[PDB]
Write an enzyme that holds these catalytic residues in place. Sequence first.
Site, short mmCIF file in Angstrom:
data_model
loop_
_atom_site.label_atom_id
_atom_site.label_comp_id
_atom_site.label_asym_id
_atom_site.label_seq_id
_atom_site.Cartn_x
_atom_site.Cartn_y
_atom_site.Cartn_z
N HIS A 94 0.93 -1.25 -0.12
CA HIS A 94 0.11 0.09 -0.03
C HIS A 94 0.92 1.10 -0.03
CE1 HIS A 94 -2.47 -3.13 1.90
NE2 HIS A 94 -3.41 -2.65 1.34
N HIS B 117 -4.07 3.37 -3.34
CA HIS B 117 -4.46 2.84 -2.09
C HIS B 117 -3.51 1.46 -1.64
CE1 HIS B 117 -6.42 0.99 1.49
NE2 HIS B 117 -6.29 0.08 0.63
N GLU C 52 -18.49 -3.53 24.26
CA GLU C 52 -17.53 -4.62 24.24
C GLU C 52 -16.42 -4.60 23.58
OE1 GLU C 52 -20.85 -4.65 23.50
OE2 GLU C 52 -21.84 -5.70 25.41
N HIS D 145 -29.12 -14.61 24.75
CA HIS D 145 -27.95 -14.51 25.46
C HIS D 145 -27.34 -15.60 25.91
CE1 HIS D 145 -30.08 -10.79 25.87
NE2 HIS D 145 -29.43 -10.14 27.10
#
Lengths: 675, 675
Positions: A25, A259, A413, A476
């Site tokens: 890159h 890129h 999280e 859950h």
Amino acid sequence: SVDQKAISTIRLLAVDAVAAANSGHPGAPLGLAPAAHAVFKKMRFNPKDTKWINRDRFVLSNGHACALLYSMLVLYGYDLTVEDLKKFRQLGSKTPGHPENTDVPGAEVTTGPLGQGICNGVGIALAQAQFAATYNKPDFPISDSYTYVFLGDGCLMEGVSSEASSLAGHLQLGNLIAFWDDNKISIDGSTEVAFTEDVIARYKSYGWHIVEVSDADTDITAIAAAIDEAKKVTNKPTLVRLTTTIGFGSLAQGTHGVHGAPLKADDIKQLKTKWGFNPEESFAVPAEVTASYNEHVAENQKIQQQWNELFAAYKQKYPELGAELQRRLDGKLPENWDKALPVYTPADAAVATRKLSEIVLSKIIPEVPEIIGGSADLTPSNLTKAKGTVDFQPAATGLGDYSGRYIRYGVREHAMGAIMNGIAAFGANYKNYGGTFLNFVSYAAGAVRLSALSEFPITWVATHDSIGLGEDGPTHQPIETLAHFRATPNISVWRPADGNETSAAYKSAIESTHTPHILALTRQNLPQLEGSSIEKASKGGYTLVQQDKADIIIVATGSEVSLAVDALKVLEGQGIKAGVVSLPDQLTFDKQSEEYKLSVLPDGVPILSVEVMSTFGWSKYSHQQFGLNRFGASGKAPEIFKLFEFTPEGVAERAAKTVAFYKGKDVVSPLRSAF
Amino acid sequence: SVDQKAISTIRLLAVDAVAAANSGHPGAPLGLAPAAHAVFKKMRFNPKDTKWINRDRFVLSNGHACALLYSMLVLYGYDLTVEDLKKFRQLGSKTPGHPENTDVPGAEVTTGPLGQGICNGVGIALAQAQFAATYNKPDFPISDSYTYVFLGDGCLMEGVSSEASSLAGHLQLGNLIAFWDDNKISIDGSTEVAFTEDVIARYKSYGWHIVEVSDADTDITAIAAAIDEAKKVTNKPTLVRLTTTIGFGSLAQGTHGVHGAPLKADDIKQLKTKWGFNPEESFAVPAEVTASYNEHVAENQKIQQQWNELFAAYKQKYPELGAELQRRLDGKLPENWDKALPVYTPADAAVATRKLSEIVLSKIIPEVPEIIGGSADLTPSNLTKAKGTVDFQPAATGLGDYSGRYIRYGVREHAMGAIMNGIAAFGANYKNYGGTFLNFVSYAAGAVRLSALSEFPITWVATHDSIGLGEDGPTHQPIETLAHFRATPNISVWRPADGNETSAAYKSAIESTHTPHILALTRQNLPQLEGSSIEKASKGGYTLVQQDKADIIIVATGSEVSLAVDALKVLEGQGIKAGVVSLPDQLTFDKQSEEYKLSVLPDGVPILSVEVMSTFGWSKYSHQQFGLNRFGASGKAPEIFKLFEFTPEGVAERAAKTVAFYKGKDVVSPLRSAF
Ligand SMILES: *CCCOP(=O)(O)OP(=O)(O)O
Ligand SMILES: *CCCOP(=O)(O)OP(=O)(O)O
Ligand SMILES: Cc1nccc(N)n1
Ligand SMILES: Cc1nccc(N)n1
Ligand SMILES: [Ca+2]
Ligand SMILES: [Ca+2]
């Protein structure tokens, strides 16, 4: 000028590295070379001591741009050379296609997966603030370093960076200075196709300070001034908008094509001639650039030398804090710290392993200052906060202090996982943890995998591990989660059955230096087992109930060990003798000697595994597997266990069928293999 | 008033349901009842036809508040009763602790994991815009429905919602109207502890319209007016800030304690008396509330009746579009659509499966209008866009149109996954896909698991599946990823070896109605196999090379099938006869008859698996497993395969060792088990 020559050198080293690999890159390295030059000139670091605890840290969050990072490290005389740059992206080299902290001197973290590095930077800055609050004294600025992060558009689209940026603004982390490569190009083309939000307005909404540099292709004076301005804003992290041209200087500058693919050879020639380099030469390092960079290194080394004398004077004035700091910098826990771990006997009451974990933390946090941690908005459910500690908050809020030990991550999280990696990366022996429900550790998989690849000793306190949580139901209740993480290299996945096993799990997690831990903990109460101990559970797997004439061995984890013990009693009434093995951590067990492992899982006897989630992986240790390979249910937990036949009678029935299935067959340990 | 009585009824049904279960979340239902009443009064829906394609959709993204949703559905006469509310959170009930679209009439999606529902709402709104652009004509507003989403603070902290909100603002989705429960309380206490950002300023930065309702505990007139205002803003999604008191009316209102635990019995009594209900009665439904809600249902049913006549008139005026729309509403693909799938022979050139996938999409997109999809900023790498289609963009941008078929998701894998779930939830036979690298599907695990639990036929186009990607290195190379998703119930994980298998994978993915698909595709070229066909690969596993006197069978997937075939030739020179099984999808294979599966994996012969990632799961199908259980490397892909001995000679060596290990042993199929 020499600065202009240095910038050209950086640009051309990066382009030549990509060219040699025919992979990688070049665009972002070309656009960010001026900023990299300016930032490294402001940074304090020692290429000959990458672990100096008061260094400024640099994180390349846009890790695909790593030819830029490697070029800086080479020019500054880290343990990385032009010969390594020539081996960019080649098997076994010190210059992999994305930076790896285990392999690359001067790479603080492993980046490449977008969004991670900025969050790691938040964690490095959080750790620095906590560390400084713990150790600094009047006339003793033991810790006063900055955290510099480069990031791109892709990083700003990834939700994990939003989580960490919101939290960093809340935490008033004024030593964090991030730089956005505002080049308007991603892989799919213009950012106009998918990324039209007002980034600056969003960062203001999080409480960040903003500096804009409109000509970051050339204006290193303004980039340096932006750093000085950011340093004056001590109660906000700063985002510096660097308006750059991707691939600056290339014939193809300003296009997506620069890129992620090597430049054309004629393009590289014109780059070299317009910047005064020889188009016939590659990997040129002008001696005047080396001299200029060496002068900055020499100044930084004198700064570190003075810091060493400051530290010696600190130890004289503050003997106890100084010895604590020295121990931490040596990577050692307090002597005999593990004597604080709770021990249980079978006469003690049944306790959920989430509560046992709370009790461990309550005992060890006061004894081990390098433990800090938090929860993702589940503090009263995960039971992760020790009573009597204060939260990590800026004192200006009245809600805590930077000397605090408990982090309120909010419902974040993934960022919690990546921030934990940054806290570990800071060093100073930090042993840090993060609580959530086990099923939502999966939200943070991108960061968890990087904990494993980066060899960071972070710990997930992952409660509500199974259908045992009951009424919240299948959205859950983990099924696949332990298989996922056990299948990832270098993750210790502890599923302790009782008090002694939970202490062993924490002993492993806190002693770890290179392996992340996930502790899978219960909502529901479990009995203390006859035969458990910290000593035996520390082996990862052990014989809980030995039966010399066993017709079957049942191997189980967590809540299912007590179930196996109850099944043994049912089987005895059917004339079947069973042994029981507890396997609280498969990774730790796997690392034991072959003879030890065979003493636990011997030849000549059928072995049945029992664990109330996926059966994947369990054939390593068993001939037959009783698990749960479907989603759960919303109801009272004991009723769910009954529905799925995770009962003493259900286990016994499958054990009896296993004995019958192997009648007349020769059975060898599951540990045996052909190769 | 009757409206005030309805709001009290909703509140008390929710509290009584939580009380009966002694589990669940009363706080948000109490705070959001006025808004729920107001929104449902504005919504068009038929409780007796939950699939009416022009209904407004409602999503409860804060799924823990589902006692509120269930109370609304009961009051409006969906197929859910007060008797079901009495069984809230009880095993087997129609009222699980978080809403499940498979189980709950009127639940559009499965929520509970925070952040998902708002993203699902973005996808429902995206689908509605695409659908309307495809079918609406002058005087024929076939589709003009809205998407209403309730969300809380936790949802706003989760990064996935930031991703989807940025994208929704970019896409100018003016029929999306979201409502933030601004109650300043989460599980850890005040939002001041972790969530102090200026939410409204952030949503303005994404291009959303804002309406603020300062007294949402009572001001239903203002909530209704906010909806009317949002409907006038046709080029921006709207966020309505509802300032509420969590647990409104409770003695414990405004505290974290009311978020997630049942109220005290004396608290419930005082709620009832102050609202004019009998404190001795539970689950009261005043007949005047039923009458008022029935009147709205009757009006909505007349609206649907008129829509049915509009649709009949549309079929007369636009016969082809009308028949297409009818077919889609019947859930049927075009007759013989699969004749467009490409077929290959062993004389055809080697092709990467990512390119084969591009070719399939190029053939089927023009033939199946209900296929839409996109990439997470990897369009030129995943090869997910058919040449000659236009992007899904608001026409105002000049970059596409809402009739477009290709979505530029940006670097937003998790939101892409949850948006795909919303597109599937819209209905109308949408078969939608999302491209990224396989290793970054893991960023979207929260949504992928919900695709499986919700039974949505979404498809991940997951390229760069292994170390075969080469130089990007171990941060990009999957190891654990297929084990993770194969261990999740109800995920079809296709890893096609060649052109025919890739067509079979797409046949499965597009025909799916209840099972999400992940297609694991290669960067590198693979040969067309002798013995492959769409017919055989459609069975999920099949005998590629039959050997009647086999000493061993090698079972493999993807890039390793050709490796196994090459190993067969090496083994023949060592005097060992091998068969080869290709296992492109384990789930599809598992669903075949026991006799079919045993014809592929028979008794009496050792079976070795070969796949260049985790060995977890493979013991279902093999006696010995050759896999990769460590992280990868940065280098040219063929060199990495050689390093890890994934070569014809390395496979042959392990096959020969397997034959030797079973000499003198009786071997039965891995498909056999004791129970
Ligand atoms: C970490 C963000 C980098 O995102 P991209 O904008 O895709 O990188 P680029 O080098 O500008 O093409
Ligand atoms: C989906 C967001 C809900 O977040 P919370 O603020 O934690 O929910 P609450 O009912 O207000 O406690
Ligand atoms: C998370 C991610 N997505 C796409 C590309 C990348 N490098 N990282
Ligand atoms: C993603 C998540 N985190 C915490 C709680 C919850 N319900 N969902
Ligand atoms: Ca960019
Ligand atoms: Ca809230």
